[PDB]
């Protein structure tokens, strides 16, 4: 909102400063830029942005009082290049003049903020996310960063919450109105890249409150999101993730038109530096419109999947007495003994990449059959892709329960997540 001295935003096929201070912004040819305000820095020498701050109005203060915010998406390590990922630090944003200033740096799974004052004194603060989680909230997924500086503290906030704090009471004058160079710099593979959006600078130390608000505003969209935080799309192959059953995936049971639930395979080598669960497993689903290709809250869809090259569909049986029942997975058909219409929902009021899938009788029927989920059926105990009436009450309970088994995320293949072995 207020105190914004740089505000890099997409406009008319270009990246511009909308702060009102009219910084000069030069995007070189190697930066990929789109109207979702996303830009990509690659390993190419022409993949850079030069921002020249207006030297007159912006001023270096005696003591630090300034903040930087942006969204970032950092690809997964390569399994065959773990050590290079762990060890090789590369600058992504550099803002120096007369050997003083600031930079943003990455070393594998660590993001690093660094200050150098006019006397050559340096201080750093970093945020590092775990690379041994079954399912990471951070790896190759859009998240929100804010760094704040005053005379006492450099802090990093992730997704609105304080993560790191360095004492910088020994830091004196920092020259912070130098050229800002957005460019990958250091010992990086040909393949390395970074995505960023909504890069902004403030001439104050932002409050936690101010940052949390910014997180929510910038999180907002009418459209739903995929697992990576990109817009959810019609007519796109997606694997399915369950936020309440993180390690579970859907597979058509052999010679039976139901979806059994199996346990995700993991990274199969012994390498004690990393661990992850495979994401590109289970049926390949695809969302179709019932009636752009962006999925919005309240849209009516078919949830389909590929059985070899045939396109099958997810149904609920019209007659079900129990609280929970298995879904029917079968060819596209008009049969009036099964509901085929789903309304995609977003019941969470906080930022999320999860959505819910609500079965209805038709597009105008006010009645609600239930939400798609996972349930343990006693036959042997065994988990199945299901519909459940039970979620209908749960989804109204505030605050919204993040870990309900009715919470789904859609995972497309992405160049920033490889898991071949």
């Amino acid at each position: 909102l207020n105190n914004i001295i740089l505000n890099l935003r997409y406009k008319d096929n270009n990246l511009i400063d909308l702060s009102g201070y009219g910084a000069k912004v030069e995007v070189y040819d190697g930066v990929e830029l789109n109207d979702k305000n996303q830009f990509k820095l690659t390993s190419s020498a022409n993949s850079k942005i030069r921002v020249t701050q207006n030297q007159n109005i912006i001023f270096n203060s005696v003591f630090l009082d300034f903040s930087v915010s942006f969204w970032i998406r950092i690809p997964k390590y390569k399994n065959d290049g773990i050590q290079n990922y762990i060890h090789n630090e590369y600058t992504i944003i550099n803002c120096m003049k007369n050997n003083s200033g600031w930079k943003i740096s990455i070393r594998g799974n660590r993001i690093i903020w660094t200050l150098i004052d006019i006397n050559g004194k340096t201080k750093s603060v970093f945020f590092e996310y775990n690379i041994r989680e079954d399912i990471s909230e951070y790896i190759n997924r859009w998240f929100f960063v804010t760094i704040t500086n005053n005379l006492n503290n450099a802090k990093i906030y992730i997704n609105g919450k304080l993560e790191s704090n360095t004492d910088i009471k020994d830091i004196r004058e920092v020259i912070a109105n130098g050229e800002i160079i957005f460019k990958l710099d250091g010992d990086i593979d040909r393949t390395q890249f970074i995505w960023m959006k909504y890069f902004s600078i403030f001439n104050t130390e932002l409050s936690q409150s101010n940052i949390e608000e910014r997180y929510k505003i910038q999180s907002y969209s009418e459209y739903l999101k995929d697992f990576w935080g990109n817009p959810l799309m019609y007519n796109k192959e997606y694997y399915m993730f369950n936020a309440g059953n993180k390690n579970s995936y859907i597979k058509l049971k052999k010679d039976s038109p139901v979806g059994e639930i199996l346990t995700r395979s993991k990274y199969n080598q012994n390498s004690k530096y990393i661990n992850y669960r495979d994401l590109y497993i289970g049926e390949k689903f695809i969302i179709r419109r019932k009636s752009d290709d962006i999925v919005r809250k309240e849209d009516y869809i078919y949830l389909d999947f590929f059985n070899l090259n045939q396109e099958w569909r997810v149904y609920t049986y019209k007659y079900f007495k129990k609280e929970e029942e298995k879904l029917f997975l079968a060819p596209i058909s008009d049969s009036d003994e099964f509901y085929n219409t789903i309304q995609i929902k977003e019941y969470d009021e906080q930022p999320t990449y999860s959505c819910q899938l609500l079965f209805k009788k038709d597009e105008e029927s006010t009645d609600e059959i239930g939400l798609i989920g996972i349930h343990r059926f006693y036959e042997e105990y065994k988990d199945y892709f299901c519909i459940s009436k039970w979620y209908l009450k749960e989804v109204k309970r505030k605050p919204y329960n993040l870990k309900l088994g009715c919470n789904w995320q859609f995972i497309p293949k992405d160049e920033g997540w490889t898991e071949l072995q």
């Binding site: 010679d255 039976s256 038109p257 139901v258 049986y317 079900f320 029942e325 298995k326 029917f328 079968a330 060819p331 058909s333 049969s335 003994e337």
Partner: peptide
């Protein structure tokens, strides 16, 4: 057709 034959399997799954 495939659909009605699968429906029969599904009825076993329902425990009907």
């Amino acid at each position: 057709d495939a659909f009605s034959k699968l429906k029969e399997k599904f009825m076993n799954e329902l425990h009907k």
